[PDB]
Coordinates of C-alpha atoms and ligand atoms in Angstrom, one line a residue:
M1 CA 92.6 124.4 105.0
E2 CA 91.4 122.7 102.3
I3 CA 92.0 119.7 99.7
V4 CA 92.6 120.8 96.3
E5 CA 91.0 118.5 93.7
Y6 CA 91.5 117.7 89.9
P7 CA 92.1 119.9 87.6
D8 CA 93.3 122.7 90.0
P9 CA 96.9 123.5 88.2
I10 CA 98.1 123.5 91.9
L11 CA 98.3 119.8 91.7
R12 CA 100.7 120.3 88.4
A13 CA 102.7 122.9 89.6
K14 CA 106.6 122.8 90.4
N15 CA 107.2 122.1 94.0
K16 CA 109.9 123.8 95.7
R17 CA 112.8 122.5 97.8
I18 CA 112.6 123.9 101.4
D19 CA 115.7 125.6 102.7
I20 CA 114.2 126.8 106.1
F21 CA 113.7 124.9 109.0
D22 CA 111.9 126.7 111.3
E23 CA 108.8 127.2 113.7
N24 CA 106.8 128.0 110.4
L25 CA 107.8 124.7 108.9
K26 CA 106.7 122.8 112.2
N27 CA 103.6 124.6 112.3
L28 CA 102.7 123.4 108.5
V29 CA 103.8 119.7 109.3
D30 CA 101.5 119.7 111.9
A31 CA 98.8 121.2 110.0
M32 CA 99.1 118.7 107.4
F33 CA 99.2 115.5 109.7
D34 CA 95.8 116.7 111.3
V35 CA 94.1 117.1 107.7
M36 CA 95.9 113.3 107.3
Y37 CA 93.9 112.1 110.3
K38 CA 91.0 114.0 109.7
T39 CA 90.8 112.4 106.0
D40 CA 92.0 109.0 107.5
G41 CA 95.3 109.2 105.2
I42 CA 98.7 107.3 105.7
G43 CA 100.1 110.1 103.6
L44 CA 99.9 113.5 102.6
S45 CA 101.8 115.9 100.5
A46 CA 102.0 119.8 100.5
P47 CA 100.4 120.7 96.9
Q48 CA 97.0 118.6 98.0
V49 CA 96.6 121.1 100.9
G50 CA 97.5 124.1 98.3
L51 CA 101.3 124.6 98.8
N52 CA 103.8 123.9 96.3
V53 CA 106.6 122.7 98.2
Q54 CA 108.3 119.5 98.6
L55 CA 106.9 118.2 101.9
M56 CA 104.9 114.9 102.9
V57 CA 103.8 113.9 106.3
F58 CA 103.7 110.1 106.2
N59 CA 102.1 107.6 109.2
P60 CA 102.7 104.1 108.1
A61 CA 99.9 102.7 110.2
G62 CA 97.4 105.7 109.6
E63 CA 95.9 106.1 112.8
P64 CA 96.2 108.4 115.8
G65 CA 98.4 106.4 118.4
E66 CA 100.2 104.0 116.5
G67 CA 103.0 103.7 113.9
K68 CA 105.4 107.0 113.8
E69 CA 104.9 110.2 112.6
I70 CA 107.4 110.5 109.7
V71 CA 108.3 114.2 108.1
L72 CA 110.0 113.8 104.6
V73 CA 111.1 116.9 103.4
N74 CA 112.6 117.3 100.0
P75 CA 112.3 113.3 99.7
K76 CA 113.7 111.2 96.6
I77 CA 112.9 107.8 95.8
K78 CA 116.4 106.1 95.1
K79 CA 115.3 102.7 94.2
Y80 CA 112.0 100.8 93.0
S81 CA 111.5 97.1 93.2
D82 CA 111.6 94.9 89.9
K83 CA 108.5 93.3 91.4
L84 CA 105.3 94.8 90.5
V85 CA 101.8 94.3 91.9
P86 CA 98.1 95.8 90.9
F87 CA 95.9 97.8 93.7
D88 CA 92.8 99.8 93.8
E89 CA 93.9 103.4 94.7
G90 CA 91.7 106.3 95.5
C91 CA 93.1 110.0 95.8
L92 CA 91.5 112.8 97.7
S93 CA 91.7 115.1 94.9
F94 CA 89.6 112.9 92.8
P95 CA 86.4 112.3 95.4
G96 CA 84.9 109.0 95.2
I97 CA 87.1 107.6 92.4
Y98 CA 89.0 104.3 92.7
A99 CA 90.8 102.4 90.0
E100 CA 93.6 99.9 89.5
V101 CA 97.1 101.1 89.5
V102 CA 100.1 98.7 88.8
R103 CA 103.4 99.9 90.9
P104 CA 106.7 98.6 92.6
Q105 CA 105.8 96.6 95.5
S106 CA 108.7 98.3 97.6
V107 CA 111.1 101.6 97.5
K108 CA 114.0 103.1 99.2
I109 CA 113.7 107.0 99.9
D110 CA 115.9 109.6 101.0
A111 CA 114.5 113.0 102.7
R112 CA 115.5 115.3 105.5
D113 CA 113.4 115.3 108.7
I114 CA 111.8 118.7 110.3
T115 CA 115.3 120.1 111.6
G116 CA 116.8 119.3 108.1
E117 CA 118.8 116.2 108.9
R118 CA 119.3 113.6 106.0
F119 CA 117.7 110.2 106.3
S120 CA 116.8 107.2 104.5
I121 CA 114.2 104.8 104.8
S122 CA 112.8 101.7 103.2
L123 CA 108.8 100.8 102.7
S124 CA 106.7 97.8 100.9
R125 CA 103.3 96.6 100.8
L126 CA 100.7 99.5 101.9
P127 CA 102.9 102.2 103.2
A128 CA 105.0 101.7 99.8
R129 CA 101.9 102.1 97.8
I130 CA 100.5 105.4 99.4
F131 CA 104.2 106.7 99.7
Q132 CA 104.5 106.2 95.8
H133 CA 101.1 107.9 95.4
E134 CA 101.9 111.0 97.7
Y135 CA 105.6 111.5 96.3
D136 CA 104.0 111.5 92.8
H137 CA 102.1 114.4 93.9
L138 CA 105.5 116.2 94.6
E139 CA 106.5 115.6 91.2
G140 CA 103.3 117.0 89.8
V141 CA 102.3 113.2 88.6
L142 CA 98.4 112.4 89.3
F143 CA 97.5 108.7 89.7
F144 CA 95.6 108.2 86.4
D145 CA 98.9 109.4 84.6
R146 CA 99.8 105.7 85.8
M147 CA 96.9 103.8 84.7
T148 CA 96.4 101.7 81.5
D149 CA 94.3 103.1 78.7
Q150 CA 91.5 100.3 79.3
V151 CA 91.4 101.6 83.2
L152 CA 91.5 105.2 82.4
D153 CA 88.5 104.6 80.1
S154 CA 86.4 103.3 83.1
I155 CA 87.1 106.5 85.0
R156 CA 86.9 109.1 82.2
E157 CA 83.5 110.6 82.5
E158 CA 84.2 111.2 86.4
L159 CA 87.2 113.1 85.6
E160 CA 85.1 115.2 83.2
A161 CA 82.7 115.6 85.8
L162 CA 85.6 116.9 87.9
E163 CA 86.7 119.2 84.4
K164 CA 83.3 120.7 84.5
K165 CA 83.1 121.5 88.3
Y166 CA 86.2 123.6 88.1
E167 CA 85.0 125.7 85.1
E168 CA 82.0 126.3 86.9
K169 CA 83.7 127.5 90.0
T170 CA 86.5 129.5 88.6
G171 CA 85.2 130.7 84.9
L172 CA 88.4 129.5 83.8
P173 CA 88.7 126.4 81.0
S174 CA 89.7 123.4 82.5
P175 CA 93.8 123.6 82.1
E176 CA 93.9 119.8 81.4
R177 CA 91.6 117.5 80.0
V178 CA 91.5 113.8 80.1
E179 CA 90.3 113.7 76.7
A180 CA 94.0 114.7 75.9
Ligands
ZN1 ZN1 90.0 125.7 105.4
ZN2 ZN1 98.2 119.4 115.6
ZN3 ZN1 91.7 104.2 109.2
ZN4 ZN1 97.5 113.0 98.8
ZN5 ZN1 96.5 111.5 95.7
ZN6 ZN1 85.0 113.9 76.7

C-alpha cells in the first residue's frame, strides 16, 4: 500500500460517493485502519492511500486498543463552531512539514457506517482538529490551502522540494505549484 504525497493529483481528484457496502469495503476499511496504526494516526482518508472515494477511518484515541474504531462513509460537516483555535498540523502527504493552521474548535458530522446506516457525531479538541484535516482530503483540500500567507511562506521551499521529487519520479510537470 502506499501514502500518496503532494503534489500527486490523486490528492486533488474528485472523490466518489460509495453505494456498495460489501466484503470489499469491509476489507479496504481494515487495510486503512492498519496504515493509520502503522503511521500512528487518529484519522485516515482513502485518497491518501490512493483511492478516490469518500471513506475515512478514524479512532479518536489514535492508538491500538484505545478509543473506538469509527468508519465514516460519505461524511459531511453539518456545523462548524464559531470558536477558532491555532494548532501545528502535519500531514502524511507532506513528510516532515509542520505549520500553524487555524480551525474551528468543534464540528458535527453526518456519515454512514460500514453497513451503510446513517449516523451523526460531534467532535472537539484534537479529534475535531484531525477530523477536519482528513475531511479536507475528501474535498480535494490540502492543509496549506488553509494557512495564512505568512505561514505558507515559511513552508514554500519544502513544498517546492516535494514538487521537484514528483517531477523527478514521474517525468511529468508538477500539476500544481505553490508559487501559484
Ligand atoms: Zn505497498
Ligand atoms: Zn487488519
Ligand atoms: Zn500515538
Ligand atoms: Zn490523512
Ligand atoms: Zn493530511
Ligand atoms: Zn519558487
